[PDB]
Amino acid sequence: RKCPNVLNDPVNVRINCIPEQFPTEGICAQRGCCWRPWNDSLIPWCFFVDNHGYNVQDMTTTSIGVEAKLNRIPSPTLFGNDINSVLFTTQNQTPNRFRFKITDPNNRRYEVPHQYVKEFTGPTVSDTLYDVKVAQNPFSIQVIRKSNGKTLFDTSIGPLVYSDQYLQISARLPSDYIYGIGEQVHKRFRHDLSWKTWPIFTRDQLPGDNNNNLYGHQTFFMCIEDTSGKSFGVFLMNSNAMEIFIQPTPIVTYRVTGGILDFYILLGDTPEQVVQQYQQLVGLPAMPAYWNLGFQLSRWNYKSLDVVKEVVRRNREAGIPFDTQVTDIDYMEDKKDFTYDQVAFNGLPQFVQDLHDHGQKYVIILDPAISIGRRANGTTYATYERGNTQHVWINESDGSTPIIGEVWPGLTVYPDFTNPNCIDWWANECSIFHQEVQYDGLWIDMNEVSSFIQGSTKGCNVNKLNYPPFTPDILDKLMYSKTICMDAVQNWGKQYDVHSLYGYSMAIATEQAVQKVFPNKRSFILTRSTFAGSGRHAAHWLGDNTASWEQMEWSITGMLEFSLFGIPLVGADICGFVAETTEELCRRWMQLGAFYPFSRNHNSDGYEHQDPAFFGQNSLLVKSSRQYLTIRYTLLPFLYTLFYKAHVFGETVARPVLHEFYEDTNSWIEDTEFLWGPALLITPVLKQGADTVSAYIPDAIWYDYESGAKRPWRKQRVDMYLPADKIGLHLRGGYIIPIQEPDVTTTASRKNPLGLIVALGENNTAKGDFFWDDGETKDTIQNGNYILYTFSVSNNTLDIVCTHSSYQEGTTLAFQTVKILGLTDSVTEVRVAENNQPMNAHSNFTYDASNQVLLIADLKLNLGRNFSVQW
Numbered sequence: 001r002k003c004p005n006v007l008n009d010p011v012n013v014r015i016n017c018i019p020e021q022f023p024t025e026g027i028c029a030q031r032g033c034c035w036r037p038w039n040d041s042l043i044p045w046c047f048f049v050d051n052h053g054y055n056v057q058d059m060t061t062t063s064i065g066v067e068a069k070l071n072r073i074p075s076p077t078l079f080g081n082d083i084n085s086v087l088f089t090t091q092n093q094t095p096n097r098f099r100f101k102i103t104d105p106n107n108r109r110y111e112v113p114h115q116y117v118k119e120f121t122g123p124t125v126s127d128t129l130y131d132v133k134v135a136q137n138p139f140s141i142q143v144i145r146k147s148n149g150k151t152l153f154d155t156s157i158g159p160l161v162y163s164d165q166y167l168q169i170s171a172r173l174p175s176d177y178i179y180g181i182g183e184q185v186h187k188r189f190r191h192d193l194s195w196k197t198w199p200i201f202t203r204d205q206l207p208g209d210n211n212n213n214l215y216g217h218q219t220f221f222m223c224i225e226d227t228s229g230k231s232f233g234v235f236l237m238n239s240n241a242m243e244i245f246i247q248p249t250p251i252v253t254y255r256v257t258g259g260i261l262d263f264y265i266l267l268g269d270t271p272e273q274v275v276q277q278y279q280q281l282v283g284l285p286a287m288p289a290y291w292n293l294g295f296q297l298s299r300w301n302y303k304s305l306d307v308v309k310e311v312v313r314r315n316r317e318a319g320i321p322f323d324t325q326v327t328d329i330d331y332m333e334d335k336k337d338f339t340y341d342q343v344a345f346n347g348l349p350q351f352v353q354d355l356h357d358h359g360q361k362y363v364i365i366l367d368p369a370i371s372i373g374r375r376a377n378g379t380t381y382a383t384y385e386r387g388n389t390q391h392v393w394i395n396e397s398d399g400s401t402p403i404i405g406e407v408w409p410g411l412t413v414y415p416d417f418t419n420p421n422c423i424d425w426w427a428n429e430c431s432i433f434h435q436e437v438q439y440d441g442l443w444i445d446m447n448e449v450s451s452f453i454q455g456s457t458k459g460c461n462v463n464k465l466n467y468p469p470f471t472p473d474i475l476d477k478l479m480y481s482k483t484i485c486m487d488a489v490q491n492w493g494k495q496y497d498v499h500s501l502y503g504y505s506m507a508i509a510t511e512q513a514v515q516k517v518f519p520n521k522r523s524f525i526l527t528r529s530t531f532a533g534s535g536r537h538a539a540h541w542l543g544d545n546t547a548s549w550e551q552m553e554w555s556i557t558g559m560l561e562f563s564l565f566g567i568p569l570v571g572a573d574i575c576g577f578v579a580e581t582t583e584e585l586c587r588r589w590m591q592l593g594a595f596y597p598f599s600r601n602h603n604s605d606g607y608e609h610q611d612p613a614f615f616g617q618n619s620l621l622v623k624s625s626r627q628y629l630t631i632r633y634t635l636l637p638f639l640y641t642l643f644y645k646a647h648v649f650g651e652t653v654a655r656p657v658l659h660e661f662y663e664d665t666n667s668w669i670e671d672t673e674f675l676w677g678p679a680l681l682i683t684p685v686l687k688q689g690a691d692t693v694s695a696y697i698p699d700a701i702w703y704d705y706e707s708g709a710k711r712p713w714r715k716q717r718v719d720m721y722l723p724a725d726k727i728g729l730h731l732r733g734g735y736i737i738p739i740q741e742p743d744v745t746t747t748a749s750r751k752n753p754l755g756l757i758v759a760l761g762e763n764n765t766a767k768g769d770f771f772w773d774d775g776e777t778k779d780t781i782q783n784g785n786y787i788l789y790t791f792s793v794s795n796n797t798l799d800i801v802c803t804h805s806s807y808q809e810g811t812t813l814a815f816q817t818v819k820i821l822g823l824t825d826s827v828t829e830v831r832v833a834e835n836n837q838p839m840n841a842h843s844n845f846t847y848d849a850s851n852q853v854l855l856i857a858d859l860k861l862n863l864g865r866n867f868s869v870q871w
């Protein structure tokens with residue numbers, strides 16, 4: 001009896017027993033599964049029922065959870081090499097965090113050498129939010145929210161399959177609303193449940209309208225259980241190539257090509273809390289330098305320093321705020337790291353001095369792969385000589401011959417960033433180069449790792465690693481496609497196991513380079529490839545996008561997913577990397593892009609210039625771009641405080657509407673607009689030819705940003721008028737945000753007067769806060785060298801409370817302007833008290849009753865002190 005008892009079984013709960021090929025009766029019979037072909041090709045024709053799996057043999061309680069020996073039910077194999085006996089272990093890590101793993105007690109299988117996640121042995125946790133039930137015949141696990149008895153994660157729906165190069169487990173989930181998994185192009189933030197496959201294996205590929213695995217390896221996803229906001233997260237700690245399959249019910253199935261099963265289930269009262277718990281586990285995001293938040297200009301192939309200078313000149317002339325000039329691989333001599341082109345980039349050091357004189361920053365690209373060739377003068381490439389002497393390279397399977405691939409400079413060897421000696425070499429290369437070219441930050445690219453020859457110069461050995469028995473739906477269906485051989489050797493292990501950790505290890509390595517090059521500074525690291533917890537070391541951008549309306553639209557989902565992944569400094573190539581942009585598209589994308597946490601206009605090789613001033617000093621594009629970038633720069637104290645909260649508490653920066661308005665099921669699918677923290681709603685034009693956007697307005701009071709006027713919209717879908725020069729910007733009632741008088745660089749804006757915008761809620765209250773430090777020193781938060789404020793308004797009294805003050809230079813700044821929105825009662829008098837001394841009349845205010853706005857001007861409320869302001 002291989003089949004269910006009823007002839008018309010529930011099809012949505014069929015678990016595919018022939019996941020990898022078109023279903024045939026013979027293969028189904030040979031695998032011992034149930035054959036029932038269907039109306040279509042979405043529903044499985046061959047499925048498992050209870051034919052495969054494991055039984056519990058012995059189970060005992062430990063001080064921190066459970067341990068069960070599992071024995072395999074003696075059925076036919078799927079892909080060979082079954083592990084007959086397996087050890088199931090659980091850990092009640094915190095009240096919100098549950099962990100289980102399934103290992104081989106007789107063979108120490110590959111485990112991810114994560115540099116943050118720690119060994120756990122205690123302390124024993126008395127009151128957990130989760131209950132865990134383990135069924136014995138067959139083996140299954142149920143994770144239950146104790147408060148309402150709701151099962152969150154239920155594996156009894158399918159078998160445990162555990163074999164050397166194929167691991168499989170499924171879980172039924174309690175709601176139809178799931179978010180996360182990457183890096184792929186999802187198009188929609190909320191997951192399509194209709195039989196979708198998501199492959200995960202770091203890969204250099206242009207994002208497009210398909211399910212390809214792209215640059216990062218992110219298994220995390222979360223699920224909102226109900227309108228209460230209760231939510232949970234599922235994280236698999238495994239870096240092997242895999243597929244995540246989603247079907248209606250919903251059921252999620254993992255199909256993984258190696259390693260162990262090591263799952264974390266994370267409970268939260270809200271979706272934001274789930275994300276916070278996730279970051280608590282894998283590592284809180286790095287605090288960026290304040291300048292990282294400035295607008296960046298960039299393109300592949302400016303071709304000469306003369307062109308770079310002209311681009312800089314024209315955008316300065318237009319008054320485009322921008323902190324940073326980025327230079328791509330053309331700055332190098334013949335695309336070799338740690339060189340610059342003495343011909344086309346003659347005078348580069350003096351150009352960097354000019355940037356620095358204008359208070360601007362210079363960022364360079366670095367690729368991991370090192371040329372095996374000579375320099376242009378015929379001399380040895382010292383970077384390679386020194387790498388050879390230090391034995392820093394990834395080796396062939398022989399464990400002694402460096403593997404040769406190909407990238408930009410030609411044939412290349414690959415640093416093993418997991419090797420301590422390689423980290424030192426790299427730090428030393430960055431330091432040597434910084435004496436020649438005084439760059440301020442680093443963009444680390446092609447670190448999947450990418451290769452333009454398949455596997456290596458010698459091809460690949462035909463073995464089980466380069467050609468596994470199960471191949472997930474990865475692009476090309478070939479493990480070593482666009483990368484190095486699976487049997488290549490690193491300090492952390494075989495490429496088969498550690499491939500997806502290359503970008504992760506390189507960011508760690510480059511973080512240590514930064515500490516050598518810029519002692520005790522944050523600098524900037526932008527990475528292409530990421531793994532779980534990469535946000536602790538770097539920023540990310542969505543990679544090599546295209547100049548189309550669709551790609552602009554999809555960038556919001558892309559951004560939001562990385563927020564979930566705890567990589568808050570994220571954005572897309574504004575105006576589009578591949579292809580020529582149009583004036584309309586670039587103007588719209590500049591508006592939206594001013595509100596990416598990471599804001600950079602970047603262009604591919606050979607297409608027309610798309611920096612803002614190129615469209616004309618008097619263009620509508622320059623005017624619109626200058627205006628929204630000035631708004632961005634004005635809001636940087638607010639944005640920066642969000643990054644402080646991400647770094648310390650795991651809160652998101654660019655935030656899904658769902659995170660604030662989960663009580664409203666309309667927010668569950670909302671992905672064409674987003675929030676900065678809880679307080680600012682950004683609604684872009686995303687369709688060619690449009691001056692009107694169908695927008696969902698959540699259940700809050702909203703004030704138009706530019707005019708302060710209350711919108712007559714609440715908890716409704718509106719047709720928002722947004723003509724050519726307008727993007728939708730609304731402030732939410734109940735929040736107080738800090739601002740600073742803007743300038744064209746953050747270097748200048750940081751010296752300017754501060755202000756506060758109070759957007760009053762329904763009961764005329766509001767709250768918020770403000771973090772301020774030197775903007776650059778690593779560990780200011782750890783060492784307590786910062787200023788911290790809370791703000792609170794009720795009944796026409798603003799309280800400004802300094803809860804921490806240990807940054808003397810911050811003290812030279814002052815709040816000089818207070819704006820109150822939605823103020824319904826007239827103002828007779830404004831009074832100010834400092835440090836609980838008596839109130840003095842303040843004469844400079846304007847009460848606009850038509851607009852309900854109170855402007856209080858010419859204040860001098862110095863940072864470091866407490867104030868009260870009454871109207």
Ligand SMILES: *[C@@H]1O[C@H](CO)[C@@H](O[C@@H]2O[C@H](CO)[C@@H](O[C@@H]3O[C@H](CO)[C@@H](O)[C@H](O[C@H]4O[C@H](CO)[C@@H](O)[C@H](O)[C@@H]4O)[C@@H]3O)[C@H](O)[C@H]2NC(C)=O)[C@H](O)[C@H]1NC(C)=O
Nearest residue numbers: 760761762763764765766767792793794795796797798825
């Ligand atoms: C902002 O200012 C407004 C004034 O415009 C101010 O409103 C007042 O608040 C108090 C509450 O602190 C109200 O007093 C309550 O009145 C209701 C009847 O209307 C009673 O039910 C309440 O008694 C209960 O609660 C007490 C505890 O507060 C218990 O001791 C008692 O046994 C009862 O359980 C209570 O007396 C007052 O009526 C209003 N006035 C007006 C005009 O509405 C408001 O509190 C201020 N808001 C903030 C944020 O501070």
Ligand SMILES: *[C@@H]1O[C@H](CO)[C@@H](O[C@@H]2O[C@H](CO)[C@@H](O)[C@H](O)[C@H]2NC(C)=O)[C@H](O)[C@H]1NC(C)=O
Nearest residue numbers: 391393394395399400401402416421489490491
């Ligand atoms: C890759 O191959 C090189 C040898 O070509 C290995 O280099 C050794 O590195 C250690 C330092 O850690 C030296 O003490 C040895 O002398 C080196 N061996 C030789 C023969 O030069 C390197 O360890 C290999 N890397 C990996 C991870 O396999």
Ligand SMILES: *[C@@H]1O[C@H](CO)[C@@H](O)[C@H](O)[C@H]1NC(C)=O
Nearest residue numbers: 007008011037038039040043
């Ligand atoms: C598929 O089959 C079932 C009964 O076997 C039927 O209810 C359903 O309508 C069929 N699907 C279609 C679209 O014909």
Ligand SMILES: *[C@@H]1O[C@H](CO)[C@@H](O)[C@H](O)[C@H]1NC(C)=O
Nearest residue numbers: 842843844845857858859860
């Ligand atoms: C007060 O407002 C007036 C009106 O603009 C202005 O001229 C004056 O300089 C302001 N500032 C101070 C500090 O009083």
Ligand SMILES: [Cl-]
Nearest residue numbers: 289521522523
């Ligand atoms: Cl810095």
